[PDB]
Design a binder for this molecule. Structure first.
Ligand code: FE
Ligand code: FE
Lengths: 215, 104, 315, 440, 215
């Protein structure tokens, strides 16, 4: 029995960037329904099991969306925006040139995601379940940061990626605050809401996940 | 027939790519593939963007008597589900990137 | 027996139901004629009415996918053919960095195959090798170096079975592009109804707009509506840019598909017709598809369903 | 029963009771053989048929009816049986048209002024304007107010200027190509030779949606009706098979019709480049047999079936499903150039050996000018080898290429499964019934 | 090039079932944006120019590997078809040949209504719900598609359209898609439009029965 956790901030704490009315419907109605329907059909293990190597089982849409929204609420904070630091900034500059270049590519991906979906910053340290898929001599640059778009409920977990940041591009996430203006919603997300300390924290776990596999 | 192979097989080509377009695509971060005189059969399972840096390749679709020729400086997009033989007759070098649905 | 290859036709006096459910035999309650219409495959490009203009030391060795080369004494069978679990030799390869999954597998017993010699020559020097080997990417010529299809079963129609028996002035041409009328909801205008469709699909509010004759309106590029004469049939010629009258206001002997006997007379001053079915009707000529009638008496049995292909010599 | 079988033959097998125009001998044979073998003919039909076996009796019978011989010869070619209910074509409001240049102007490979073309292309947005029948009266121009000079046709006139320039420069070339490719004339082919008249409309003058007035020129039992719409190609209304049994009563050669262009195609590939439907008379309710695809030519240069089906809109040649998922197959790392490197490696090593000593068969010639003996000799004197290392780095590049395709394939699968997009090429892969050393 | 076609009614004519503000954003921003984006693409490709709208959608669909122009080309047709699918004083039941065909292909209008409702309730994410006329089978069906896909890509003839993209109902109903579907069937769906679309479709399908001589 999975439970709907509240966001780590008060529902009025994202004003004026994200209104309480949006949070009342996005979390109180959409996210709540995903958890309620998931419990009738029965979290990371559930998402992988219900994905079923592409032949998605009935529980996948509820399970993946429930995980996605919980990940989404932790990706933002009332005093977000700015720039990251530490190893995250070093990796961003290594794989995107500079932080400014990364922001433009991330915004463009979120803008061009057609229909309902999610845009992810992920740490790519995947392993494949096929034969002759192991590199004898890894170069240590193969574990890199990537920007990936997914439709509907899909998340990078189904390809054994490590998500670090996401933005919800379903229209219900921004229509009460920006109507059709998704560009302004994306720009507001990266300048006022994004929590880089949470993204940095998730990077450490992803790095440790790869380190444990290599030993 | 009268219709060129590029039109029939939906092989988008952008011969003589400007440097600005290369940087917009981020070609400098693409992986490198090279070969000598050989023949490569392949069936594309996803779209592939190829920027040829040196040499030339002649692409013969499955069952075809004609070929498509791409030279250094051309940007080629091989479509998904394409089956062809790639022929090389000299040193060849390229930078490639595979594209899933949407992406680019 | 059928004198020629073709398809079977009968008009009347042959029972449509077979004599038995499984069989293809039909009875004749009356005397009738059975016609054999004369006639001469990828199924994705050959379709109905297509026109066919064309007729139908280990460092010298190597280990690859399902194959390997060898410059341990090698024992090859007499025929050069290996079966499963066969001994061929009683570190062979450079131990490549990558090894693809192969159906073949060593054990030296071959298990999972042909063997032949490979020789490399350069400037009068010879080095022999033994090559033992077993989706488009899995493949193991160099660009640098009549008849009309009748399908329903295929027959070819050609000249061997079809033969010929021998304002401004109004001109045929375009009237313009019909535009959507919002009253009729359709992006491409309905233009006309037939007797059946007017009863099924005519809305109540559109009964006032049903007309027995044609009415022509012209919209120019600024949105103005022109009629010239709203009580006659006048349209604009798009090439000459002038008005002209329509032909009608829109309020031969031989018929298509008829069968002829071998000496039917169409007119006293004309040569006798040949047997067959009228395939093409034109202003002053007709093209006939050759057919041969067979007379059959009551109680006879027809071997084949309608339009069944019969080859020469078939019963 | 003998009601469903007759219906089954009509619908499934295309049966129709086509008229059989019999000679007197054939007519007598069918009427007399129904009575017996050698019996006195009793039925009035067989008795009359016996009399008609003499043409002298027929002439006497014809004179007594007051008709001529040729009229009697024409009465035997008459459609028997009942007649279909007569057509009642109703106009769905008035016919309202615009003069819109075809969207596909200009033809491929023909250069026009792009500034004039953009002026022409402005008229294509006029299709979005809404017109209501309650509004074609408020400012209607009639009589002297509806002369041609009063109308704004500036964008269509610029198209006409470009069209006439194209016609005068390509008219002879198009006729030459018609003779080169099409041996004999046929409805749908280009009118040429003595039959050509200046002023006939070329194909780029037409576009789907246009309304034309024309005359029926040819009826084909298996193809349809061909209509002259003032062009160098005749239009084609697809009608075939049983439908002609009733439609022949209404669609006749030489009669004037109103047609709408539904498709325009390339005459090199398609037999009938102009596809039409009858607007007046409306016979939509009488047409049941449809063409799955428009018929095409199979020409001299068409050697690859996969290329032919791409030139038209036809499905791929089906194949048996492999039964294995491509995303679950092992990666490929054998670079195709490695086999060439191996031959060069062997050639260098055997040349080095000769240098020391004397300072079913396939033969592989190797050139000395494609070998790097300067580096090989230094490696030989110093003592895997460099060429073996060179083979592994080519394998690594090929393995990396396979890995990146598989990773993109895995993401592509998830997107397509979520959005209901095909994983395999549609039409391909039809289903069934359609057709140790290392460790030692 | 294609123009932006006005709906066949004023933007406040669907009140109170579909608000004027919904029409202003849905038609004036979403539909307008699709037209403007499509026209830019058509101005660079002379081959895609010159296709009819139906031909362009089928060509850009590319047998399941859509070209970049497909999303804009499909959406402009979908929205034009959608505005004509609704009328002031719509809803209730169809009459004459539309009712007869529905009763023949579904058993009754009640069976059709449940199938249409269930297809609209179970379409996950953005998409469309269609009443279609099957060309090969010569019967009506209920089909749901995702994102911009329309039945034209499979040579089917649309009859009635319903937009279940979130932007079409979120201002008036928020997460209550079921109320939006029920309102569409009760007060908005235009069966008069379906009558004419079936009449146009009868030029290619011939839903009648042939007259077969007894001879
Ligand atoms: Fe959401
Ligand atoms: Fe919409």
């Amino acid at each position: 029995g999975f439970e709907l956790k509240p966001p780590p901030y008060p529902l009025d704490a994202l004003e004026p960037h994200m209104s309480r009315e949006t949070l009342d419907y996005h979390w109180g109605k959409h996210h709540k329904t995903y958890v309620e329907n998931l419990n009738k059909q029965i979290l990371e293990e559930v998402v992988l099991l219900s994905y079923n190597r592409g032949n998605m089982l009935p529980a996948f849409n509820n399970a993946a969306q429930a995980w996605n929204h919980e990940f989404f609420w932790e990706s933002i904070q009332p005093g977000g925006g700015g720039k990251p630091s530490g190893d995250l900034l070093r990796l961003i500059e290594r794989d995107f040139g500079s932080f400014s270049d990364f922001v433009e590519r991330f915004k463009a991906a979120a803008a061009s995601n057609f229909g309902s979906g999610w845009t992810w910053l992920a740490y790519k340290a995947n392993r494949l379940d096929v034969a002759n898929a192991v590199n004898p001599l890894p170069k240590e640059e193969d574990k890199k940061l990537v920007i990936v778009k997914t439709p509907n409920a899909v998340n990078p977990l189904v390809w054994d990626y490590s998500p670090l940041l996401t933005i919800d591009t379903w229209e219900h996430a921004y229509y009460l605050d920006f109507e059709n203006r998704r560009i302004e919603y994306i720009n507001t997300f990266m300048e006022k809401l994004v929590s880089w300390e949470t993204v940095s924290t998730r990077l450490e776990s992803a790095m440790a996940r790869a380190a444990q596999r290599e030993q | 027939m009268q219709t060129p192979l590029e039109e029939l097989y939906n092989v988008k080509v952008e011969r003589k790519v400007s440097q600005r377009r290369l940087e917009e695509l981020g070609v400098s971060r693409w992986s490198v593939w090279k070969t000598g005189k050989c023949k490569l059969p392949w069936d594309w399972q996803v779209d592939q963007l190829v920027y040829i840096e040196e040499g030339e390749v002649r692409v013969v679709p499955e069952g075809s008597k004609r070929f498509m020729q791409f030279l250094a400086g051309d940007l080629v997009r091989y479509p998904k589900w394409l089956e062809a033989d790639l022929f090389f007759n000299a040193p060849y070098s390229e930078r490639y990137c595979f594209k899933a649905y949407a992406d680019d | 027996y059928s004198d020629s290859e073709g398809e079977m036709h009968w008009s009347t006096d042959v029972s449509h139901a077979p004599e038995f459910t499984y069989s293809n035999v039909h009875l004749l309650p009356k005397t009738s004629h059975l016609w054999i219409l004369s006639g001469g495959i990828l199924f994705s490009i050959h379709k109905d009415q297509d026109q066919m203009n064309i007729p139908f030391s280990d460092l010298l060795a190597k280990r690859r996918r399902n194959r390997f080369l060898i410059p341990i004494s090698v024992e090859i069978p007499i025929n050069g053919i290996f079966r499963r679990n066969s001994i061929f030799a009683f570190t062979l390869f450079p131990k490549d960095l990558f090894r693809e999954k192969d159906n073949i597998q060593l054990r030296l017993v071959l298990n999972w195959v042909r063997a032949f010699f490979v020789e490399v020559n350069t400037k009068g020097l010879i080095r022999d090798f033994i090559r033992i080997g077993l989706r488009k990417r899995n493949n193991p010529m160099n660009p640098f170096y009549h008849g009309t299809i009748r399908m329903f079963s295929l027959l070819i129609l050609s000249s061997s079975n079809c033969f010929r028996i021998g304002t401004i002035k109004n001109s045929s041409g375009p009237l313009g592009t019909a535009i959507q009328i919002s009253n009729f909801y359709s992006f491409l205008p309905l233009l006309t109804y037939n007797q059946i469709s007017v009863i099924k699909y005519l809305q109540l509010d559109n009964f006032k707009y049903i007309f027995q004759v044609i009415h022509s309106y012209l919209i120019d590029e600024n949105g103005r509506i022109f009629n010239l004469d709203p009580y006659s049939n006048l349209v604009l010629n798009p090439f000459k840019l002038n008005w002209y009258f329509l032909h009608q206001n829109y309020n031969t002997i031989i018929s298509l598909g008829q069968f002829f006997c071998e000496n039917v007379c169409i007119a006293k001053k004309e040569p006798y017709l040949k047997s067959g079915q009228v395939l093409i009707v034109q202003r002053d000529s007709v093209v006939i598809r050759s057919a041969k009638p067979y007379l059959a008496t009551p109680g006879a049995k027809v071997h084949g369903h309608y339009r069944e292909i019969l080859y020469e010599g078939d019963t | 029963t003998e009601d469903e079988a007759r219906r089954r033959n009509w619908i499934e097998r295309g049966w129709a009771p086509w008229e059989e125009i019999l000679t007197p001998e054939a007519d007598f044979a069918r009427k007399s053989l129904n009575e017996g073998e050698e019996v006195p003919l009793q039925s009035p039909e067989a008795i009359e048929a016996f009399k008609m076996l003499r043409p002298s009796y027929r002439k006497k019978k014809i004179k007594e009816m007051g008709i001529t011989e040729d009229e009697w010869y024409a009465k035997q070619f008459e459609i028997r049986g009942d007649k279909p209910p007569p057509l009642d074509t109703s106009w769905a409001g008035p016919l309202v048209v615009r003069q819109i240049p075809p969207r596909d102007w200009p033809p491929k490979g023909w250069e026009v002024d792009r500034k004039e073309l953009e002026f022409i292309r402005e008229a294509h947005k006029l299709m979005a304007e809404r017109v209501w029948l309650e509004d074609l009266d408020k400012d209607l121009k009639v009589g002297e107010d509806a002369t041609v000079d009063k109308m704004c046709l500036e964008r269509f006139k610029v198209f006409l200027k470009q069209y006439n320039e194209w016609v005068e420069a390509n008219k002879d070339r198009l006729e030459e190509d018609s003779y080169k490719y099409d041996q004999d004339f046929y409805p749908g082919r280009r009118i040429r030779g003595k039959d050509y008249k200046e002023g006939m409309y070329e194909l780029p003058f037409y576009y789907p949606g246009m309304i034309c007035e024309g005359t029926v020129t040819t009826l084909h039992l298996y193809q349809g009706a061909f209509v002259d719409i003032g062009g160098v190609h005749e239009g084609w209304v697809p009608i075939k098979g049983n439908d002609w049994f009733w439609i022949r009563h209404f669609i006749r050669v030489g009669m004037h019709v109103i047609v709408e262009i539904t498709a325009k195609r390339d005459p090199y590939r398609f037999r009938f480049p102009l596809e039409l439907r009858f607007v007046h008379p409306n016979i939509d309710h009488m047409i049941f047999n449809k063409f799955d695809f428009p018929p095409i030519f199979h020409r001299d240069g068409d050697t690859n079936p996969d290329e032919i089906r791409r030139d038209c809109g036809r499905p791929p040649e089906p194949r048996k499903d492999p039964g294995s998922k491509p995303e679950e197959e092992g990666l490929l790392s054998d670079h195709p150039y490695v086999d060439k490197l191996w031959q060069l490696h062997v050639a260098e090593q055997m040349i080095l050996d000769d240098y020391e000593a004397n300072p079913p068969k396939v033969i592989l010639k190797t050139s000395v000018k494609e070998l790097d003996l300067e580096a090989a000799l230094i490696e030989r004197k110093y003592h895997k080898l460099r060429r073996n290392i060179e083979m592994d780095e080519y394998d690594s590049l090929h393995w990396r290429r396979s890995l990146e395709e598989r990773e993109a394939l895995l993401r592509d699968i998830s997107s397509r499964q979520a959005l209901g997009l095909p994983l395999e090429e549609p039409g391909r892969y039809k289903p069934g019934s359609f057709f140790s050393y290392d460790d030692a | 090039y294609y123009g932006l076609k006005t709906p066949p009614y004023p933007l406040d004519a669907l009140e109170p079932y579909m608000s004027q503000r919904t029409l202003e954003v849905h038609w004036g921003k979403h539909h307008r944006g699709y037209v403007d984006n499509l026209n830019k693409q058509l101005g660079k490709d002379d081959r895609l120019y010159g296709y009819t709208m139906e031909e362009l959608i089928k060509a850009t669909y590319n047998n399941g590997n859509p070209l970049p122009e497909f999303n804009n080309a499909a959406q402009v047709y979908n929205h034009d078809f959608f505005w004509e699918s609704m009328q002031p004083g719509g809803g209730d039941m169809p009459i004459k040949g539309v009712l007869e065909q529905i009763e023949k292909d579904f058993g009754s209008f009640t069976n059709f209504r449940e199938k249409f409702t269930n297809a609209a309730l179970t379409q996950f994410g953005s998409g469309w719900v269609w009443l279609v006329l099957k060309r090969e089978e010569r019967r009506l069906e209920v089909v749901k598609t995702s994102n911009a896909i329309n039945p034209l890509v499979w040579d089917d003839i649309p009859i009635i359209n319903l937009d279940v993209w979130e932007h079409s109902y979120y201002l008036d109903y928020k997460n209550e898609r079921g109320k939006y579907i029920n309102t569409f069937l009760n007060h908005l769906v235009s069966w008069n439009a379906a009558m004419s679309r079936m009449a146009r479709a009868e030029a290619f399908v011939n839903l009648g029965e042939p007259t077969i001589p007894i001879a």
